Amino acid sequence: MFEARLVQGSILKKVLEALKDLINEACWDISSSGVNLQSMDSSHVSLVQLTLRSEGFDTYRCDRNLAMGVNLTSMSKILKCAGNEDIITLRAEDNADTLALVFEAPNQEKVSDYEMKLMDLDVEQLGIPEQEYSCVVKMPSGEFARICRDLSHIGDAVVISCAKDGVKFSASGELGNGNIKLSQTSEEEAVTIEMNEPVQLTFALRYLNFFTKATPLSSTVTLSMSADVPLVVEYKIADMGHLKYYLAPKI
């Protein structure tokens, strides 16, 4: 039997909002340690990895390992029925074919219970060796979102260049070209850039704009890059875990 009670339900609402636009279905691997979710989008251009530790929940119970196949589009729609101040509980039986979501309003006079069917999903393995990157940039999450949004008005792809001094994001299109340069500042609104060697990569803005849907989950975002390797964009979910996105570069 599975029981996960999250007092700050808005966290789950934000997670689904950050997932649904990128992937429509995924397997939520549940265990005594928490919730793990990993899935590539249909085009295999990006991969999302979610971690929600048991310690982050008010109450957490998962007698046995479970792999629940879930329609994220449907789950997000149901989470729309939860207030931002609702306590949210996810509940499932041992051999669950359904997932129950319970929302407790802050007024204590209203309690909602939603049940959605689970689905069989061919959860695919995806060996990704955690390594070190040539360049790691940490910046305000809102700042990164605004950069991706702005350049999207200019082009469909962004060239990210790293070197001594800062990081530059460049795009070009029919209306002209633009470059946004970020230089290290002197935790939330600061910019830190650790460079091992200059790196230049091109990425599709369409996917980056999907990643920034996770902005409300954290005040900061960290970008990790290395030549000819997937970009990694990470958002820490305050004392819960994190949401990591991987994106294959162009070429």
Binding site: M40, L47, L126, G127, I128, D228, K250
Partner: peptide, 13 residues
């Protein structure tokens, strides 16, 4: 051209 993560990672899922 846009690459896919399969060209960078081993899957077999």
């Amino acid at each position: 051209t846009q690459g896919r993560l399969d060209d960078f990672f081993k899957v077999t899922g």
